[PDB]
Structure formats: structure tokens, C-alpha cells
């Protein structure tokens, strides 16, 4: 009965309310109405990250990237997913690509992207140092 945009808006309200599995289901309903909108998959990927569902998050980021190759958030969420999975070099590349795309698109997130890069590079270093 509701449209894809209305379902996305319902998902966004649930997300702000910290109802992550419910928000993800709402983005799934939006996808039923229009499966060609990258934002539905990026939003759902972020829900899956919060739910520790990394395999599902990775899959959504890949779907989003097939639809919008320039998506800052798909690259960023992909990098965060790879960092939590300890795939540090891939994570850093995707975070750096998010930074470059954000610069080209004149987007600013209060230094979130550089901050995440530093967190990722520090985690990678900690894993290297612990072998010593």
C-alpha cells in the first residue's frame, strides 16, 4: 500500500529510534517496490552492520555499488564492514576511496572519514605489532 519512498521514510524513522532489524525489514519492503535504488541497500547495509550481520552488510554494499558506483556511503560502510572482519588493507582502500569521492562531491561529515581511516590504520598496526 505504501510506496517505496514512504517505506524508506518509515525505515529511516525506525533507524533513528534504534530499531535496526525493523528498519532493515522496511528497506527490504522498499526494495520490493523499486530494487534499483542504491540508497535502500546502503541504508540496509548500515542496519546489518549494527546487527553484526557482516556477510549481509557486505552483500548490500555490493548491490549498492552496482547501482551507484560513486556512492560515498557504500564505500564507507564496505570499509567499516571489512575492518570489523579484520580485512584491514581492503578496508583502508575503501575508506580512502570514500574520502576521495566525498571530496569530489563536496560532502563533509564532520571529519568522520579521516577519523575512521585513522581508527582502521591504528587497528592494522596493532595487529602487526602483536606479531612482534
Amino acid at each position: 500500500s505504501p510506496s517505496a519512498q514512504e517505506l524508506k521514510e518509515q525505515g529511516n524513522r525506525l533507524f533513528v529510534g534504534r530499531k535496526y532489524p525493523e528498519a532493515a525489514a522496511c528497506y527490504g519492503r522498499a526494495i520490493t517496490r523499486n530494487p534499483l535504488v542504491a540508497v535502500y541497500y546502503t541504508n540496509r547495509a548500515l542496519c546489518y552492520l549494527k546487527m553484526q550481520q557482516h556477510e549481509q552488510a557486505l552483500a548490500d554494499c555490493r548491490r549498492a555499488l552496482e547501482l551507484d558506483g560513486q556512492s560515498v556511503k557504500a564505500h564507507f560502510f564496505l570499509g567499516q564492514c571489512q575492518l570489523e572482519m579484520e580485512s584491514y588493507d581492503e578496508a583502508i582502500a575503501n575508506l580512502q576511496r570514500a574520502y576521495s569521492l566525498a571530496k569530489e562531491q563536496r560532502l563533509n561529515f564532520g571529519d568522520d572519514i579521516p577519523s575512521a581511516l585513522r581508527i582502521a590504520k591504528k587497528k592494522r598496526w596493532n595487529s602487526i605489532e602483536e606479531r612482534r
Binding site: 533507524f15 528498519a23 541504508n43 548500515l46 560515498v72 556511503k73 568522520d112 572519514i113
Partner: peptide, 5 residues
């Protein structure tokens, strides 16, 4: 950045 669109 960790917000929905």
C-alpha cells in the same frame, strides 16, 4: 556519515 539517507 553513519546515518541513513
Amino acid at each position: 556519515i553513519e546515518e541513513v539517507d
